[model samples]
Target: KPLEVIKIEDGVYLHTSFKNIEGYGLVDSNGLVVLDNNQAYIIDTPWSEEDTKLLLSWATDRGYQVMASISTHSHEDRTAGIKLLNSKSIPTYTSELTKKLLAREGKPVPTHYFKDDEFTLGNGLIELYYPGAGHTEDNIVAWLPKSKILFGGCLVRSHEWEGLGYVGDASISSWADSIKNIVSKKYPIQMVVPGHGKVGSSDILDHTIDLAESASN
Candidate 1:
């Protein structure tokens, strides 16, 4: 099963939504949940419909009712399950640009928009920050104040692989600086979760910057 669980911090869970392929290896995307008492906030969804449904089921089984979910970009890996989330009436949030782009592609727009560069939930315990353009113009990062974890989405990369994450839709020129701004925030980030691959510490942000620099060469 591609659904692997990793507990990165207290009250936070990282679930890798993977599609195991034959001879082609595996494709991965990340979905995160931040627990707030009996409710929770989610970021991203699985790579496929069934997998996303499973995510919802898992959350329900765990007694974590989802309060909101945000997709950092328009790619299917980050968005495939949005319809299901909408059907379940879970509030969905995303950049206005992201929502417009999804609609242009015949996808459903999220229920709410991230205005003024961020979205606040759980009384500001969970924060989504749009640092600038990177993997995609609409890409953003989720920050958990209590855990000091940065859900860097596709904007950041892990150490195992480096190449800018299939960047056919990326803002390549702006990518590095966008990440640099994230690093400059000096958020005491204890953990960083990329869109795919293993979770790591603040060094992952540095690692992603390195990857972006390499790609521009």
Candidate 2:
């Protein structure tokens, strides 16, 4: 599906978009929509502007007001919708370091930045954490403590992924450690939504750790 929304839980939705890279053909990129009392907070943007707009429309059609959005990293897969959201006057956020990276690439910079390593959104309903460097140096993850779902973004690999997708900007040595950092938190994760591929449980985290270690070796 080019732009698709799947309900992961009562108020959490998984939004996926598609794009065809030169060598990759078609690929999937996942984002999230967390709703609280008719207000919605997006975890990341879709792969393209059209899909991003469809995602926003999906929320509005269901009577949810778009409150804010956070792009897990600076990659176009996660940040392509920032400009669209910004133009719509929607509050967009990311780590200050991610913001710098986006600006360095002349991409749309988010309107807000989180300085702390961990922060809460939707009044503590959702938690965001920066474990360390992995898929990208500034990569971060969103944890829905209530639902115990980890929006691992690109930092955590999908179980279906046989190899690390792209590592151009990856810190291979630190990737495994970063995964360990998340495991140490012991959040009782019931579901893990990867940046791409099908969703699974905490096993995906373990699989990702294994992939990271293998890549490092």
Candidate 3:
């Protein structure tokens, strides 16, 4: 198992963990840790329970308070640690839709659910937006206005990918527009972090749109 962290900006970091799955080989998944006034809010869990512990240790070791965590979708890569976090009394959250999907799949459901399309965390420094379905019906993105970084999760593809990685539950036709909705917000986005592959500029959003459109066509 490989685990790493990359600082995106002051108070913002990208956490990556690798999981070996059939067909995908050793796949790396990314998540975010947003810190504010010593409080840390996580978006997307690592690919496994043990790795999630590692992620939390990364923050707690720095004397940051672990306030809460939010998963971007229902997939294990995004949700595997919901149970562990909640058991530790670190509140875990997800879109209501994601919670439902996770329950139906018999996975551990997030401790809290938000019904709205947009929700704020860390005193509004971090924003979670449901731009519309893409990789998964419940997939969402997180925005850090203070850092001008969009944690696109799996909804946006990396420049390294020639095509969408997984679409078993993707709304391929809607993926492009979902991305467009984010762009339409005009947030002065300087960096876009996909759930996998390299971090990139706003061009990654366009590249994701291209892949979505092409895949849909």
Candidate 4:
């Protein structure tokens, strides 16, 4: 299916919608970005080469250079397109654990890696925190503090449905802890962009936390 792009705010765009397939939740090969000073840093990559090319074209058309790329996890659907971005010399970014997981799965490693806390992207900043282990062992959320928006990757699903992270090397207990950590944060979160599903409010984050906590009991 062809991807669709929607502008969620000034300099911020939601590149894909969420889809439910059978019992699994799927985040479309959509990417998000903030264009600043003729350069852009994208969160996640499309699922296919064609999608990657299309996204690149879209960014270029706006006169923006894709300087960096980030992913929520090491899942192929989320990171496979790193190769496509790398071909254009866009440095891909992910966690050290994510790099290791990708290597174990035979996927290319990210060009750069970070541990925890925040990272500065030129004039902007991104907060990277591991909310325990859910979806995958290396799953993490990218928070844009100024925007009050969180790119949760596959950690939290849309408000309409619960996220499934029991598969793979996921830890149900830690996943629950991750959700709690997000809720315990001090900042005011205006919106949450999940790896799949529509953008939601802090309620979505609360719901995921509740679900995980309940399931743990």
Candidate 5:
């Protein structure tokens, strides 16, 4: 199926991408606060211009200002649509390490760089944390304390049999530790939204941890 918008909550929407080779899982992206403080904050851009346009229209139609953009990682599949956002002067926010990777790959650096530790967003207190390196060296996850929702990004996947993506820059060991950090957290994570595949519960983290551990062994 083509991309569509799923209202995960009153103020948040999942702007999913096209499915992968198998039709079972969702290759989706996310967009939240389409019109918060008269501005829109796009989480991650989709693969193509068409998907970007669809998301932009969704925000614009809702009367959002399209203030900025942020991404979870530096991978091209996760960030290729940055050009569309840049055209609007929407300063993109990402980790410093992500900036370096982008530079090495000749991709544009995010206008705003997040620190290694947690950072706040809007009035919501969304905490951005780089749990460790998994899908990519600069992968990060957004934790919403109030909502008890963890945006796992690409650090974990819900699809069974879909192994972790260990490209040249990834650390298989660090990825396992990252999953441990999440599991050790005291917060009750009621739901999780991954960068790809379906939304899941704490089991998603468990599965990722198991995969990484088995790979190490």
Candidate 6:
């Protein structure tokens, strides 16, 4: 199926990339394509080469020069899109911690490394931040300063989210505080795109915190 696009603003686009995992039924994911001077950066992909064809086509058909793809964390849903981007010579980036996790899993890793707490792209239009640990030790949130959009990836849950999807790498103990730090201190986000579900206002962050906190207790 063609990757669905959810336009958040004039220059911001969202992609839903899904996959199926046995025993777990079907697992899905979300990715973002942000425009900066006609060049684009993908936040994540379905994490497999086969499923990324449509998403890639969507960007290229619009004449976007994809500069890089950022895997927010080491999980398959987040990191899966890296392989497809790399095949086209588009560079991939991830936190050093994620890189190590990928290495341990014998999974595909990124071409570049982000060892620090933050990464800027598209001339500061996009910011990838690591705010302590909630979902994972290396999970990074994408901040679009100009758009005031926060792509929380898996770390931030949608308002309608049923429960915490994956807790294997979860750090529920500090999830609420980590989320509040961004929502309260960040640029008063106009919209939030969670890693798995519907996009909405700041409440997505709050809902995620609730899920984390409730699970922790």
Best-performing candidate as measured by TM-score? 2
Model 5 gets an lDDT of 0.73
Regions more than 4 Å wrong, model 5? 19-38, 165-168
Candidate 5 C-alpha error for residue 29, in Å: 5.0
Q: What tens-digit string does per-residue lDDT give for candidate 2 at 20-91?
A: 779858889899999898999999999889999999999899999999999999999998999999999999
- In candidate 2 the C-alpha lDDT for residue 146 amounts to 84
Which is the leading candidate under lDDT? 2
| 138: Cα error in model 1, Å | 1.2
Cα lDDT for residue 91, model 4?
Answer: 93
Question: TM-scores, in order shown?
Answer: 0.94, 0.97, 0.96, 0.89, 0.86, 0.91
The TM-score obtained by model 4 is 0.89
Instruction: Please list the residue runs of candidate 4 whose C-alpha ends up more than 4 Å from where it truly belongs after superposition.
Output: 17-30, 162-166
Determine the backbone clash count of candidate 4.
2
Candidate 3: the clashing residue pairs are none
Clashes of each: 0, 0, 0, 2, 0, 2
Which ranges in model 3 have alpha carbons more than 4 Å from their true place? 22-24
Alpha-carbon runs more than 4 Å astray in model 2: 22-24
Residue 20 alpha-carbon offset, candidate 4, angstroms: 11
Candidate 4 C-alpha lDDT tens digits along 118-201:
455555556777767776777888778777887887888677575464455667678777777777676588888887767888
Kindly list the per-residue Cα lDDT of model 3 for residues 7-30, writing each as its tens digit.
879988899999777886887999
| Residue 142 of model 5, lDDT score | 79
lDDT of 5 at 76: 65
The sequence of per-residue lDDT tens digits that candidate 6 reaches over residues 1-217 is 4467778787888888666667776656788888887898888876566667777888789898889888888888777778777778999888888899898989888999888887887779888888878888778898988888889888888866779877877788988788877876657688888888788888787788878889987
Error of 1 at 158 (Å): 0.4
